[PDB]
């Protein structure tokens, strides 16, 4: 019953799981004169199939778009990894405020809100449950939102919520434009890090672009009336679902551009 409220938020949650306290927690915060420029890093190739998406659901701590990840159709390749990555899911982090919403902050700024696209290494691990407990298991691509013009695809999502309210709840969700949710610049930067939620395992090749997206405030504000609790719970609303920046222990961000 880990959460974002007073009593089971982010900096309780080392007393369920220790590893909160880990050598390679994220979110961090990018501090662009420690950034490396490296020129062994590849661009960011992207084979998706907006067929691939099938439901979105409210987790109690974001809304999840689901994927069918049998196939290699929607995967991540290039950037700093090895192999093929396989799309697994898209969830969204923000704030209260629509100035201090997103995971990672760039030079001490925050964005209005942080979109993670999760995948996972299938030419190593039978499944993604699998990938979660090893260090080259996933790659988690992260956009900022800053407010401005609607993005439709963010639209397509934010009609949904209604029907998706209570945790738990679904509904079909298919033909999605995911690659209209990435920038046109595909800059970034690269750690090492883990889950920004319990388990908070430290699985994760972090890959953020530099360009954020537009969300309107009327958009982002929709996300906030989803509820962290269930049907027939006394209601409890997801306002804020953003982990605070973790410390860097010395990890190198590397950056794809100069
Ligand atoms: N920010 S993150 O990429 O680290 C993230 C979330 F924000 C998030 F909300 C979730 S979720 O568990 O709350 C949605 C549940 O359907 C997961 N998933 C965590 C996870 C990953 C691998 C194995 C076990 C749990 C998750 F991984
Ligand atoms: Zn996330």
Same mark, same amino acid.
């Given at each position: 019953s ?7 938020? =982010?900096?309780?949650?080392?007393? *369920? @799981?220790?590893?909160?306290? %880990? ?16 020129? !062994?890093?590849?661009?960011? &190739?992207?084979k998706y199939?907006?067929? &691939? ?9 974001? *809304? $999840?778009?689901? @994927?069918?990840d049998?196939? $290699?159709? !929607?995967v991540?390749? /290039? ?10 899911q898209?969830?969204?982090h923000? /704030? ?5 919403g997103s ?8 964005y ?9 290494? &299938?030419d190593?691990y ?5 990938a ?11 956009? @900022? ?19 998706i309210?209570?945790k %738990?709840k679904?509904?079909? *969700?298919?033909? *999605?434009?995911?690659? !209209?949710?990435? =920038?046109? !610049? ?10 920004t939620?319990?388990p908070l ?6 890959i953020?672009?530099?360009? =954020?997206? $537009?969300?309107?405030?009327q ?10 609790t ?6 409890? @609303?997801?306002v &804020? ?18």
């Amino acid at each position: 019953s880990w959460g974002y409220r007073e009593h089971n938020g =982010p900096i309780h949650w080392k007393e *369920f @799981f220790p590893i909160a306290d %880990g050598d390679q927690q994220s979110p961090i915060e990018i501090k662009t004169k420690e950034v490396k420029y490296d020129s !062994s890093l590849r661009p960011l &190739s992207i084979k998706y199939d907006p067929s &691939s998406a099938k439901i979105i659901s409210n987790s109690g701590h974001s *809304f $999840n778009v689901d @994927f069918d990840d049998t196939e $290699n159709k !929607s995967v991540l390749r /290039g950037g700093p990894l090895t192999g093929s990555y396989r799309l697994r899911q898209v969830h969204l982090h923000w /704030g209260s405020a629509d100035d201090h919403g997103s995971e990672h902050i760039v030079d001490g700024v925050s964005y209005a809100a942080e979109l993670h696209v999760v995948h996972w290494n &299938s030419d190593k691990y039978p499944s993604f449950v699998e990938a979660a407990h090893e260090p080259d298991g996933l790659a988690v691509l992260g956009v @900022f939102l800053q407010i401005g013009e609607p993005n439709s695809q963010l639209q397509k999502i934010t009609d949904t919520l209604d029907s998706i309210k209570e945790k %738990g709840k679904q509904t079909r *969700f298919t033909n *999605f434009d995911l690659l !209209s949710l990435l =920038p046109p !610049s595909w800059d970034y930067w690269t750690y090492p890090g883990s889950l920004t939620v319990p388990p908070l395992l430290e699985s994760v090749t972090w890959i953020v672009l530099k360009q =954020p997206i $537009n969300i309107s405030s009327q958009q982002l504000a929709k996300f906030r009336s989803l509820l962290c609790t269930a049907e027939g719970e006394a209601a409890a @609303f997801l306002v &804020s679902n953003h982990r605070p920046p973790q410390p860097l222990k010395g990890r190198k961000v590397r950056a794809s551009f100069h």
